[PDB]
Amino acid sequence: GDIRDYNDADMARLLEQWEKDDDIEEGDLPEHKRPSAPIDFSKLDPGKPESILKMTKKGKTLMMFVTVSGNPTEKETEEITSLWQGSLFNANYDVQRFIVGSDRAIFMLRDGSYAWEIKDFLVSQDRCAEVTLEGQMYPGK
């Protein structure tokens, strides 16, 4: 306590957060104790994001908009998409495929793991074609 100015000013500005806590607390004791009896929850923290399982539900309407032809004749898209419908199902890849938009073949996946795998199979053709995802195109990270 050799200098008032620095102490009160700077130290209060530093302790401001602590004083704020004390001020909003006002020393009122709540009946609410730590509800977690097994500290092991915060001790270990399982890491398993169960939230995803709680957030997920059946009804994966995620499709890939595959602009195959680019030519008015819907035939081309139907032919190639039915060929894919063959090969995929023959490869045990049971997926949903519809032709809405003469050029746009939509592949709706009930799965996800092999999303880029089937996508690869699609773009594996010389033409490549436009294969977009409903919404955004995210591989994962």
From Swiss-Prot:
Residues 113-141 are annotated as: Escort domain. GO terms for biological process: mesoderm development; ossification; phagocytosis; positive regulation of skeletal muscle acetylcholine-gated channel clustering; positive regulation of Wnt signaling pathway; protein folding; protein localization to cell surface; protein localization to plasma membrane. Residues 2-112 are annotated as: Chaperone domain. Its main location: endoplasmic reticulum. It is found in: Endoplasmic reticulum. Keywords: Chaperone, Endoplasmic reticulum, Glycoprotein, Signal, Wnt signaling pathway. GO terms for molecular function: identical protein binding; low-density lipoprotein particle receptor binding; protein folding chaperone. Chaperone specifically assisting the folding of beta-propeller/EGF modules within the family of low-density lipoprotein receptors (LDLRs). Acts as a modulator of the Wnt pathway through chaperoning the coreceptors of the canonical Wnt pathway, LRP5 and LRP6, to the plasma membrane. Essential for specification of embryonic polarity and mesoderm induction. Plays an essential role in neuromuscular junction (NMJ) formation by promoting cell-surface expression of LRP4. May regulate phagocytosis of apoptotic retinal pigment epithelium (RPE) cells. The chaperone domain provides a folding template for proper folding of the beta-propeller (BP) domains of LRP5/6. The escort domain ensures LRP5/6 safe-trafficking from the ER to the Golgi by preventing premature ligand-binding. This is LRP chaperone MESD. It comes from Mus musculus. The chain holds residues 45 to 184 of 224 of the full protein.
